[PDB]
Design a protein around this nucleic acid. Structure first.
Ligand code: TL
Ligand code: TL
Ligand code: TL
Ligand code: TL
Ligand code: TL
Ligand code: TL
Ligand code: TL
Ligand code: TL
Ligand code: TL
Ligand code: TL
Ligand code: TL
Ligand code: TL
Ligand code: TL
Ligand code: TL
Ligand code: TL
Length: 95
RNA sequence: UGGCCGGCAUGGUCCCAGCCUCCUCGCUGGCGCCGGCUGGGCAACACCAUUGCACUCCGGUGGUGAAUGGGAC
Protein backbone atom coordinates (compact mmCIF):
# COMPACT_ATOMS: atom_id res chain seq x y z
CA UNK A 1 0.00 0.00 0.00
CA UNK A 2 2.85 2.37 0.94
CA UNK A 3 3.76 5.01 -1.66
CA UNK A 4 7.10 5.93 -3.22
CA UNK A 5 8.77 9.33 -2.51
CA UNK A 6 7.24 12.25 -4.36
CA UNK A 7 7.58 16.01 -4.75
CA UNK A 8 4.03 16.21 -3.43
CA UNK A 9 2.92 15.26 0.04
CA UNK A 10 -0.65 14.18 0.57
CA UNK A 11 -2.09 15.44 3.84
CA UNK A 12 -5.39 14.25 5.18
CA UNK A 13 -7.30 14.28 8.52
CA UNK A 14 -7.46 18.08 8.18
CA UNK A 15 -10.14 20.11 10.00
CA UNK A 16 -12.90 20.32 7.37
CA UNK A 17 -14.49 23.51 8.80
CA UNK A 18 -11.65 25.68 7.41
CA UNK A 19 -12.27 27.65 4.21
CA UNK A 20 -10.04 26.83 1.26
CA UNK A 21 -8.22 30.15 1.04
CA UNK A 22 -7.41 30.06 4.76
CA UNK A 23 -6.35 26.40 4.82
CA UNK A 24 -3.89 27.04 1.96
CA UNK A 25 -2.45 30.11 3.69
CA UNK A 26 -2.11 28.26 7.00
CA UNK A 27 -0.42 25.25 5.37
CA UNK A 28 2.06 27.51 3.65
CA UNK A 29 2.76 29.12 7.01
CA UNK A 30 4.07 25.90 8.54
CA UNK A 31 5.37 23.94 5.52
CA UNK A 32 7.26 26.69 3.65
CA UNK A 33 10.41 26.27 5.76
CA UNK A 34 11.03 22.82 4.32
CA UNK A 35 11.83 24.24 0.89
CA UNK A 36 10.20 26.15 -1.97
CA UNK A 37 6.51 25.25 -2.47
CA UNK A 38 5.16 25.34 -6.03
CA UNK A 39 1.53 25.08 -4.99
CA UNK A 40 -0.95 23.76 -2.49
CA UNK A 41 -4.11 22.08 -3.77
CA UNK A 42 -7.26 21.97 -1.68
CA UNK A 43 -10.88 21.29 -2.54
CA UNK A 44 -13.96 21.15 -0.34
CA UNK A 45 -15.89 18.65 -2.50
CA UNK A 46 -17.40 15.65 -0.69
CA UNK A 47 -14.67 13.41 -2.07
CA UNK A 48 -11.76 15.77 -1.42
CA UNK A 49 -12.45 17.67 1.83
CA UNK A 50 -10.07 17.30 4.78
CA UNK A 51 -7.21 16.63 2.35
CA UNK A 52 -4.48 18.70 0.67
CA UNK A 53 -1.62 18.41 -1.77
CA UNK A 54 1.48 20.42 -0.91
CA UNK A 55 3.70 20.48 -3.95
CA UNK A 56 7.39 20.92 -3.17
CA UNK A 57 9.99 21.77 -5.79
CA UNK A 58 12.39 19.23 -4.38
CA UNK A 59 11.69 15.75 -3.02
CA UNK A 60 14.07 16.39 -0.13
CA UNK A 61 11.75 19.14 1.15
CA UNK A 62 8.70 16.85 0.91
CA UNK A 63 10.57 14.01 2.65
CA UNK A 64 11.62 16.40 5.40
CA UNK A 65 8.07 17.76 5.81
CA UNK A 66 6.58 14.27 5.93
CA UNK A 67 8.75 13.08 8.83
CA UNK A 68 8.89 16.43 10.65
CA UNK A 69 5.15 17.23 10.64
CA UNK A 70 3.62 13.76 10.90
CA UNK A 71 0.71 14.03 13.32
CA UNK A 72 1.24 17.77 13.90
CA UNK A 73 -1.79 19.40 15.67
CA UNK A 74 -3.36 21.73 13.10
CA UNK A 75 -6.73 23.36 13.71
CA UNK A 76 -7.02 20.88 16.60
CA UNK A 77 -6.49 17.71 14.54
CA UNK A 78 -3.38 15.49 14.17
CA UNK A 79 -2.28 15.99 10.59
CA UNK A 80 -1.65 12.67 8.76
CA UNK A 81 0.92 12.85 5.96
CA UNK A 82 2.15 10.54 3.17
CA UNK A 83 3.62 11.01 -0.30
CA UNK A 84 0.98 11.45 -3.04
CA UNK A 85 0.46 8.35 -5.23
CA UNK A 86 1.49 10.18 -8.41
CA UNK A 87 3.11 13.40 -9.60
CA UNK A 88 1.21 16.68 -9.70
CA UNK A 89 0.72 18.11 -13.20
CA UNK A 90 2.94 21.03 -12.14
CA UNK A 91 5.74 18.58 -11.55
CA UNK A 92 5.12 16.85 -14.90
CA UNK A 93 5.02 20.16 -16.78
CA UNK A 94 8.54 20.72 -15.49
CA UNK A 95 10.30 17.46 -14.79
C1' U B 1 -43.57 37.33 0.74
C1' G B 2 -37.56 35.05 -2.14
C1' G B 3 -42.61 34.78 -5.44
C1' C B 4 -48.65 34.44 -4.34
C1' C B 5 -53.43 34.13 -2.41
C1' G B 6 -57.34 33.75 1.65
C1' G B 7 -59.49 34.86 6.63
C1' C B 8 -59.29 37.97 10.74
C1' A B 9 -57.84 42.21 13.47
C1' U B 10 -56.15 47.31 12.77
C1' G B 11 -57.76 55.46 12.66
C1' G B 12 -53.41 58.67 10.04
C1' U B 13 -48.62 60.53 9.63
C1' C B 14 -43.91 61.17 11.01
C1' C B 15 -39.42 60.98 14.99
C1' C B 16 -36.20 58.04 18.43
C1' A B 17 -34.60 53.36 20.27
C1' G B 18 -34.32 48.17 20.32
C1' C B 19 -34.76 43.96 17.68
C1' C B 20 -35.20 40.59 13.18
C1' U B 21 -33.48 38.15 8.49
C1' C B 22 -30.72 31.75 3.39
C1' C B 23 -32.72 34.83 -1.44
C1' U B 24 -31.78 43.36 -2.33
C1' C B 25 -28.72 43.42 6.85
C1' G B 26 -30.59 48.66 6.36
C1' C B 27 -32.65 53.89 8.27
C1' U B 28 -37.17 56.33 1.37
C1' G B 29 -36.03 47.01 4.76
C1' G B 30 -39.48 44.70 8.43
C1' C B 31 -41.02 43.89 13.54
C1' G B 32 -50.85 42.65 14.66
C1' C B 33 -53.06 37.33 14.14
C1' C B 34 -54.17 32.41 11.25
C1' G B 35 -53.88 29.38 7.36
C1' G B 36 -52.66 27.70 2.43
C1' C B 37 -49.58 27.19 -2.84
C1' U B 38 -45.04 27.71 -4.57
C1' G B 39 -39.42 29.49 -7.39
C1' G B 40 -34.00 29.91 -6.63
C1' G B 41 -29.29 28.64 -4.07
C1' C B 42 -26.14 25.87 -1.08
C1' A B 43 -22.82 31.58 -1.24
C1' A B 44 -22.82 32.51 4.22
C1' C B 45 -24.64 30.18 8.69
C1' A B 46 -26.37 25.44 10.87
C1' C B 47 -26.92 20.43 10.77
C1' C B 48 -26.47 15.48 8.53
C1' A B 49 -23.21 12.28 5.97
C1' U B 50 -17.96 11.86 4.53
C1' U B 51 -10.76 9.79 6.71
C1' G B 52 -11.58 10.69 1.16
C1' C B 53 -5.04 10.56 -3.83
C1' A B 54 -6.49 15.26 -6.57
C1' C B 55 -4.58 18.39 -10.55
C1' U B 56 -12.63 20.21 -14.95
C1' C B 57 -16.59 24.11 -9.75
C1' C B 58 -19.77 20.20 -8.32
C1' G B 59 -23.00 15.50 -1.37
C1' G B 60 -27.73 16.34 1.31
C1' U B 61 -31.15 19.08 4.50
C1' G B 62 -32.58 23.63 7.32
C1' G B 63 -33.70 28.75 8.45
C1' U B 64 -38.96 34.75 7.20
C1' G B 65 -42.45 28.18 11.53
C1' A B 66 -38.25 36.14 12.14
C1' A B 67 -38.24 40.68 15.19
C1' U B 68 -40.94 45.56 20.23
C1' G B 69 -41.52 49.35 22.90
C1' G B 70 -41.51 54.51 23.63
C1' G B 71 -42.18 59.68 21.76
C1' A B 72 -44.63 63.82 18.63
C1' C B 73 -48.39 65.83 16.03
TL1 TL C 1 -40.63 33.68 2.31
TL1 TL D 1 -52.57 37.68 3.03
TL1 TL E 1 -52.65 56.35 16.25
TL1 TL F 1 -33.82 51.11 14.60
TL1 TL G 1 -33.63 39.61 4.22
TL1 TL H 1 -33.59 49.39 9.02
TL1 TL I 1 -36.30 49.86 9.09
TL1 TL J 1 -37.71 42.25 4.78
TL1 TL K 1 -48.41 31.26 5.24
TL1 TL L 1 -49.26 32.66 6.62
TL1 TL M 1 -37.30 26.71 -2.31
TL1 TL N 1 -20.04 25.30 -8.40
TL1 TL O 1 -19.84 17.25 -12.84
TL1 TL P 1 -23.20 20.69 1.37
TL1 TL Q 1 -44.98 52.79 18.51
Amino acid sequence: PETRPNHTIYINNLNEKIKKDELKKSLHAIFSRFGQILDILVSRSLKMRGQAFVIFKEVSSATNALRSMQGFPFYDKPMRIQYAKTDSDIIAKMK
